[PDB]
Amino acid sequence: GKGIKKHLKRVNAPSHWMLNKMGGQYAPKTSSGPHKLLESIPLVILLRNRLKYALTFDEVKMILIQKIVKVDNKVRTDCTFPVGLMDVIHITKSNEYFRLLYDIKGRFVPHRITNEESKYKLCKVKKILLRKGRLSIAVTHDGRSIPYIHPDVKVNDTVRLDLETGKVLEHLKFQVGSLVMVTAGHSVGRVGVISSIDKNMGTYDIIHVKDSRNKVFATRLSNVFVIGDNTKPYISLPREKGIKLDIIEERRNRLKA
Amino acid sequence: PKSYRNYSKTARNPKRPFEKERLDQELKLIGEYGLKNKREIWRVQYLLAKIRSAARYLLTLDEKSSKRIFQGEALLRRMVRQGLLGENEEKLDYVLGLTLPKLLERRLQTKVFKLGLAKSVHHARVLIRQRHIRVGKQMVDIPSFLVRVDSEKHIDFATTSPFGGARPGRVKRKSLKKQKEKTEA
Amino acid sequence: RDGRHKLRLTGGKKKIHKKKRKYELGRPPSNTKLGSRQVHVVRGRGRNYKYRAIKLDSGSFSWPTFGISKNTRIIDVVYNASNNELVRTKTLVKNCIVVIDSHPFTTWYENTFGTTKIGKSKNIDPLLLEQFKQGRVLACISSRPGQCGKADGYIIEGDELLFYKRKMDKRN
RNA sequence: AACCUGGUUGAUCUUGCCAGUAGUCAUAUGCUUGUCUCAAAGAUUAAGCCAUGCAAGUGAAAGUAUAUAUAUAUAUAUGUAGAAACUGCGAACGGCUCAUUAAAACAGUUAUAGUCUACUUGACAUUUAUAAGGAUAACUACGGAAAAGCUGUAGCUAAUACUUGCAUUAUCCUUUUGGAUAAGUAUUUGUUAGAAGGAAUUAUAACAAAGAAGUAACACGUAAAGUGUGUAUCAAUCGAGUUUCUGACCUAUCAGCUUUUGAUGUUAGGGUAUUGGCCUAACAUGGCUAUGACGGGUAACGGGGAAUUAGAGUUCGAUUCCGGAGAGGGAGCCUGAGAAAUAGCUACCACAUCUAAGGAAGGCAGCAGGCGCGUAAAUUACCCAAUUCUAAAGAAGAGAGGUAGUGACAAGAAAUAACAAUGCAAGGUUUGUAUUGGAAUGGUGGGAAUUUAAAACCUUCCCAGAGUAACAAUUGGAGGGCAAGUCUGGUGCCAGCAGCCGCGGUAAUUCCAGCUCCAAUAGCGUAUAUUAAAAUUGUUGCAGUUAAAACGCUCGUAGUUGAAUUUCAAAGAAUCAUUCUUUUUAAAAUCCGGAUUUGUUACUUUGAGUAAAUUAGAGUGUUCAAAGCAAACAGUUAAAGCAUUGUGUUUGAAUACUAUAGCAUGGAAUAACAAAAUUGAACAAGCU
RNA sequence: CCGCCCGUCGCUCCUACCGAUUGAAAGAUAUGAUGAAUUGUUUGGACAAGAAAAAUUUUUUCUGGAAAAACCGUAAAUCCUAUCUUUUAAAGGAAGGAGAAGUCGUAACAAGGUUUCCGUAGGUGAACCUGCGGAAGGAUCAU
Ligand SMILES: [Mg+2]
Ligand SMILES: [Mg+2]
Ligand SMILES: [Mg+2]
Ligand SMILES: [Mg+2]
Ligand SMILES: [Mg+2]
Ligand SMILES: [Mg+2]
Ligand SMILES: [Mg+2]
Ligand SMILES: [Mg+2]
Ligand SMILES: [Mg+2]
Ligand SMILES: [Mg+2]
Ligand SMILES: [Mg+2]
Ligand SMILES: [Mg+2]
Ligand SMILES: [Mg+2]
Ligand SMILES: [Mg+2]
Ligand SMILES: [Mg+2]
Ligand SMILES: [Mg+2]
Ligand SMILES: [Mg+2]
Ligand SMILES: [Mg+2]
Ligand SMILES: [Mg+2]
Ligand SMILES: [Mg+2]
Ligand SMILES: [Mg+2]
Ligand SMILES: [Mg+2]
Ligand SMILES: [Mg+2]
Ligand SMILES: [Mg+2]
Ligand SMILES: [Mg+2]
Ligand SMILES: [Mg+2]
Ligand SMILES: [Mg+2]
Ligand SMILES: [Mg+2]
Ligand SMILES: [Mg+2]
Ligand SMILES: [Mg+2]
Ligand SMILES: [Mg+2]
Ligand SMILES: [Mg+2]
Ligand SMILES: [Mg+2]
Ligand SMILES: [Mg+2]
Ligand SMILES: [Mg+2]
Ligand SMILES: [Mg+2]
Ligand SMILES: [Mg+2]
Ligand SMILES: [Mg+2]
């Protein structure tokens, strides 16, 4: 007939799933949801390939059936629910809290995290709609609509967003020296300060992001996620702290162990 | 669908199949290091050749080009591990200077022959195939096996051999014993 | 039917290699007329219903000067910059000039101030006034009745009105 | 491994082909084959035809059960199952094939300010009620038809089927209380007003008119008051449609095409989900083309890629992924969020099955399987265990998928002995090779351990278990090319061989044999194609007096190519004459005497952004290796760590390749082009 | 040089061409005719639910609605041409290549016994001959 595609082939699966070529013909195909399949990750993968709590899809399903895994604090029983960049996972029985982050490679790690910090999540606004009764609503990368957002919030900036209640805490403008994480090409794990934004007329607004080794790298503004003010990040970053080393340096590090 | 389990040719053929000198050389190599075909030689050439090619490529790049330093260094390290170079000759110009003897030396059978164990190369090979020999815990019954210098010292008769302490345990010796017993009784 | 099957600008035959994909839908024209109201529903793409008016009369007509609107029977079609056939057949489309039963506007005016929210000061044209005197006034249609299912329109004014009169002009 | 040998001659040097030579994820076929791993396989011919079986269903709190069964608690109460059917969701995915199709599709690159978008997520609503209206299935009874996934009648009865249909918020006065005015979500029209985006007829707000659909007459019993089902708009998402730019093979023995039949445009409409000659009407006379239009051919689906290459390249790409298309051939619809669906329907054509001859159903380019075609291709196997999908979503299904079977397609590893005595041999005492004879071991046979959904293999152990180690290696050669016989017989310009040159006319180193040798060896030949060899298509990189080849000559359009010229230079510090760095030498605008911008494009440099699989490549003893994407570490079971008795720990699955176009970007050279005098612009004053 | 060899003429084999035959065949478009099915609209109105009257029947109005029909519009298919492409037959004709020690000459290679060769025209069993103007690839680098 011809409509949408329900299946995903295991080689056509996006690399940072890190699936096998063997070990299956297909991949899980993230449900539609709050994240873009190419930059998400289904819950199945998390449960089975990352934490390794499950050996199989079946086990994951079973786990889900006990209403014990929460993603952003409300439960999910959909095995192929997409988790995505910043989202806190609360596996209830272990009393583990994860937050998904990026590695210095493209790969999702589940970070491990405290009760206290778990209660919020960072969310970058994308669009800021006006709706009926001249009320503004931000729309986050979490595919979530924040209504009655504080007026000073502008199109690219992140927002520290509470989970227990839908309301926001604080917001961090997209400034010239704002601690930033990346979430797309090459420099994906990378975490920097920002030197400069280009602001091209018709095109993508390219930005340059100085690291803490002072290695500058550029990136589209699209795929940059504000994470702090110049001093401190508002989230716990992984062990590497977004310092994508050179290849040689990495090898040296590996050797020294 | 097709499987994704990709596979690769390990050995290229000659080109000129009845060149005399080359043939003679091959034969000599076979003689010295107890090899079954020209195929083995070809395989080893291929192995060598890839490395050589890599080295050549690296040399085309300048020093302190990232690629050259990283990949080249890695190659060098690998060579060292393999027992191709060691202390004196670890500079990437040297990995070109490898020949076939250097590689054949590190075959398991050759190593076995060297380190006592068997009277010959052929003998060593048969020993290896006949499930004796071990290279650090693990038994190994392929003579090709390129021993790395890390696991050169840890080569001897396996735990479970007749002449590594685990009963005569043969069709032969056991049978003989049985016969003797019968004779006695 | 919205698709290819057409020469290539260089005038080369596009050799067709594709049936007709339903999303290239060219469902046929509702020649919507005068009469008592009668409208069908055609089911466009994602259950997006659209209202094929096939007979009409009582469209919403606006009076732009004063920026108001009223529902009136429309009594005749008199011009169609597409083609005269349509006007002959009395078919309503999105730029048909038609005649409104124009008592309502007059009534409204009377109610508000005088006799033939309020930024009044403009106070009417001569031609328009004359038209009103006979009861019946020229007015564009502005909805696409065939899609929307309403003959919504507006009263034709000043320069445009004059032009349309000229077009109409009788003469021989 | 950036490679060449034989063949024109009496000999020679060339040109030049032929021949050899190697490879092919490249088919066939011949002979041969003991292990193991891995695994392509009715593409090529006929997108030819198909018997039978199967390939999409779905119910584990949660629409509908007096079919029905059943267990508790006191004839009722709860309950627990539940065939059937209605409803819902799915069946638009997947799978197959490659016929079409050559600026089409596809790839990258935009665009959607020109749209649609079910499920999923998050926001979140507007003009009788202690609960409404019928009418329908299964079912009961009566039927019909040879037959069909045929249905007739009558009678019931549900539903989350179908259909009705019940305060508060914002604007103004008073001290949180009491009044006044309003009060429709999309959508559409007219009138205006205008936190983003480069840009708005955008969001939005108001006014005047219409206006759908909706806002629970639903179902569980849950959580620490919750959920399921449904629902208006918005956003997200899974996408889709269109769309920009750039990019393709052969053919000029295809040069003019397109336009009544929309060709090119403008206007108005119709239509669409939206843009659009997409369609209609009216009006222009355009549009494409030697930078190849338009035809023709393709034994053409495109791409990721494959083979082969030193480097260029050449060929291939039906075929693991992405995209397109198609379900015998066209065409047409219904349903639905999504189909112009084909295990949906209508029709015709072409095939074809049953029929009691009235009718009826049917579509393997799903999986097997069969006939046909053919040089050319496997089982009517077992299972949902893994991977996934669908469902009322652990619990069911799935020929999707996996597992075996056949399998010398390929690919990897690897047996067919080894060793020691004398005997014999040769060498300057040691290697080599005929008798013996104890060790070794797979194979093969049978048990287990394991493996597995269940088996089978793998590995593992234990019994069996080699001397002609009959557990028997072949294939093709021995004139040259080309490694190896002027060994023995047979044939006698016959038979034959011989890719090529040649051999054979009774000494054949070439036939037919035997023996011996050589190569590659569980493989080795033959054929056709292809790459390299081919600098024999030549960009790198050919040749043109005489070898093939300078147009008879000149002019000439496109094409290609185009003199020099415009800021040259200078000084200081480090290093082993050179390298890398700092500073200034004019003019204009900008900033509080100091400090900082200055043609366009090519080109180049950095980026950005790209699927993986393949490729290169890092790591990793799959026993090695082909692989794979895993792993390593500590322990007869605990220390050590770190956590406030409990908890293994370290990690890895890099990186580069992703055009020739597009995006941003540093640029001094080299190129273009633009700026520039029968006159061109720069200031200061004055006048408007 | 008793070398080499050229062409016709016979004979056998194979290849492709021309070929009357409106040759044939399949396929492809293009036109036209008829035109199944069918979206849409229009007409219809078997009937199923209302309203009007009498004691279940009568007459009239409003709703939804099947068949059937008409008109555009998609448009299969069939037939007729036309054109093109592709294989394919054919008496005869006329080439080519191969073969066989066949016929006739001697064209060319030597000053090849008329130097050769070019273009052109005519001739002739056949090689060829001749005319005109060229060339040396001449048998002359020379008065
Ligand atoms: Mg289709
Ligand atoms: Mg053993
Ligand atoms: Mg050849
Ligand atoms: Mg075995
Ligand atoms: Mg076929
Ligand atoms: Mg196939
Ligand atoms: Mg359930
Ligand atoms: Mg049921
Ligand atoms: Mg599909
Ligand atoms: Mg309903
Ligand atoms: Mg027209
Ligand atoms: Mg084709
Ligand atoms: Mg392909
Ligand atoms: Mg084909
Ligand atoms: Mg078929
Ligand atoms: Mg169809
Ligand atoms: Mg089928
Ligand atoms: Mg059919
Ligand atoms: Mg089949
Ligand atoms: Mg085969
Ligand atoms: Mg399963
Ligand atoms: Mg299958
Ligand atoms: Mg030789
Ligand atoms: Mg041969
Ligand atoms: Mg002889
Ligand atoms: Mg012989
Ligand atoms: Mg070639
Ligand atoms: Mg070459
Ligand atoms: Mg040449
Ligand atoms: Mg010549
Ligand atoms: Mg000339
Ligand atoms: Mg010119
Ligand atoms: Mg120049
Ligand atoms: Mg003379
Ligand atoms: Mg003569
Ligand atoms: Mg003569
Ligand atoms: Mg004469
Ligand atoms: Mg004469």
Residue numbers in the entry:
A (entry chain F): 2 to 258
B (entry chain E): 2 to 186
C (entry chain L): 5 to 120, 161 to 213, 216 to 218
Relevant lines from the article:
Much of malaria pathology is the result of exponential growth of the parasite within erythrocytes, and given the critical role that protein synthesis plays in this, the translational machinery is an attractive drug target. However, because anti-malarial treatment at the blood-stage requires rapid intervention, we focused on the dominant, blood stage-specific cytoplasmic ribosome from the most virulent form of Plasmodium, P. falciparum (Pf80S), as inhibition of cytosolic translation would be expected to be direct and fast-acting. In this present study, we solved the structure of Pf80S–emetine complex at 3.2 Å resolution and built a fully-refined all-atom model. The ribosome model comprises the large (Pf60S) and small subunit (Pf40S) with a total of 74 proteins as well as the 5S, 5.8S, 18S, and 28S rRNAs and a tRNA bound at the E-site.
This meant that eS31, located in the beak of the 40S head, could not be positioned accurately, and has therefore been omitted from the final model. The largest Pf-specific ESs are concentrated in the 18S rRNA, with ES6S and ES9S being particularly extended. Pf80S co-purifies with a tRNA bound to the E-site. Emetine binds to the E-site of the Pf40S subunit. The benzo[a]quinolizine ring of emetine mimics a base-stacking interaction with G973 of h23 and its ethyl group forms a hydrophobic interaction with C1075 and C1076 of h24, whereas the isoquinoline ring is stacked against the C-terminal Leu151 of uS11. The interaction is stabilized by a hydrogen bond formed between the NH group of the isoquinoline ring in emetine and an oxygen atom on the backbone of U2061 of h45. The C-terminus of uS11 adopts a long coil with seven basic residues (residues 141–151; RKKSGRRGRRL), which form electrostatic interactions with the phosphate backbones of h45, h23 and h24, thereby stabilizing the conformation of this coil together with the 18S rRNA.
